[PDB]
Amino acid sequence: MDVFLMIRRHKTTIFTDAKESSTVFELKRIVEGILKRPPDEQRLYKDDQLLDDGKTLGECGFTSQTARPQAPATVGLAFRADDTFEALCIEPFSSPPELPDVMK
Amino acid sequence: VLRSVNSREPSQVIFCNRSPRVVLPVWLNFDGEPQPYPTLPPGTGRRIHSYRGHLWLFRDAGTHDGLLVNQTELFVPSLNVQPIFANITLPVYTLKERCLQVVRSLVKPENYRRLDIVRSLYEDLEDHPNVQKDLERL
Amino acid sequence: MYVKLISSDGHEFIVKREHALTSGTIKAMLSTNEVNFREIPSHVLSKVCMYFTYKVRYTNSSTEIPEFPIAPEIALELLMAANFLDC
Numbered sequence: 627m628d629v630f631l632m633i634r635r636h637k638t639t640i641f642t643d644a645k646e647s648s649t650v651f652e653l654k655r656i657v658e659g660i661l662k663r664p665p666d667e668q669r670l671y672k673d674d675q676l677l678d679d680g681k682t683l684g685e686c687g688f689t690s691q692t693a694r695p696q697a698p699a700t701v702g703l704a705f706r707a708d709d710t711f712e713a714l715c716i717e718p719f720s721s722p723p724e725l726p727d728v729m730k
Numbered sequence: 731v732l733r734s735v736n737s738r739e740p741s742q743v744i745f746c747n748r749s750p751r752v753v754l755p756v757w758l759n760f761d762g763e764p765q766p767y768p769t770l771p772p773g774t775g776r777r778i779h780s781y782r783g784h785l786w787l788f789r790d791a792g793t794h795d796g797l798l799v800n801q802t803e804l805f806v807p808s809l810n811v812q813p814i815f816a817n818i819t820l821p822v823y824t825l826k827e828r829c830l831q832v833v834r835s836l837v838k839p840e841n842y843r844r845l846d847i848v849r850s851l852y853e854d855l856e857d858h859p860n861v862q863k864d865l866e867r868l
Numbered sequence: 869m870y871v872k873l874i875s876s877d878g879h880e881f882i883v884k885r886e887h888a889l890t891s892g893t894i895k896a897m898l899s900t901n902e903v904n905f906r907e908i909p910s911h912v913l914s915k916v917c918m919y920f921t922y923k924v925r926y927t928n929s930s931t932e933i934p935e936f937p938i939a940p941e942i943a944l945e946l947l948m949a950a951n952f953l954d955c
């Protein structure tokens with residue numbers, strides 16, 4: 627079963643899919659190929675919760691029911707500068723304008 | 731030209747609405763005139779007595795947006811080997827058509843010309859889906 | 869491989885090259901694995917990227933296709949981007 631995700635760090639968003647049976651570590655290898663940072667320099671999160679490497683995406687709560695193509699699930703990403711991991715931080719998207727008079 | 735064949739050969743059909751829309755089944759009569767039939771609520775089915783060679787199409791009852799039936803536009807009841815299944819579903823609309831549907835659902839046609847968008851878009855909004863226009867075909 | 873789509877407000881969206889090639893306008897803009905959209909904000913571009921995944925997942929599927937959701941607040945701007953990108 628495919629799961630559809632948004633891997634987010636600061637102002638970066640990766641749109642990718644993975645298998646429910648695939649691991650957190652395997653997702654880190656995907657991030658590696660794109661962002662050129664090894665898995666040991668990466669931390670993955672579900673909201674504020676740090677995800678363990680050997681855990682499957684399904685076990686982490688990424689299911690077909692919740693990680694849909696038209697509404698993908700968010701995975702937080704943090705990088706380590708040296709030594710010391712940076713705090714998880716995701717820049718929010720822009721705010722839509724006020725609904726025009728004719729739409730309300 | 732696009733019309734039902736008067737075969738007089740009964741064909742039992744099940745209209746299966748596998749869409750979140752209220753479905754309007756449309757029969758193309760012997761003159762090629764679209765004939766509307768009772769609407770189907772979102773997750774429901776209906777047994778209908780139709781005929782071999784008859785032409786059907788399905789639209790959203792409120793907005794007339796085009797729907798698919800057995801992955802195509804037209805459904806033609808065939809010979810009952812018993813009843814023929816007509817699986818009505820949403821097509822994968824383009825992002826543009828999907829946007830126009832949402833904007834049309836929120837804005838009264840008198841007010842399309844009040845939206846701050848390019849002129850070509852006012853014309854696209856006013857060009858509502860229509861069975862008659864779709865009937866070309868061709 | 870992957871391509872980068874940058875919003876007017878600096879958000880960088882990394883999507884599969886095949887998914888982005890769904891847009892004829894994007895296909896033309898890449899032909900240099902980064903595209904800047906000076907007029908498309910992130911709350912719109914994120915939805916465009918969800919559309920690419922939705923389209924690739926559900927095109928020629930035979931099963932049940934769900935509705936592509938659009939919040940009323942995003943509709944106008946998403947329409948303008950879809951019209952430009954020929955999405």
Ligand SMILES: CNC(=O)[C@@H]1C[C@@H](O)CN1C(=O)Cc1cc(C)no1
Pocket residue numbers: 736738757778779780781784
């Ligand atoms: C209740 N079933 C119907 O109304 C069906 C559906 C469509 O096939 C046209 N139709 C008719 O009876 C009209 C008709 C009679 C004969 C005989 N040939 O056509």
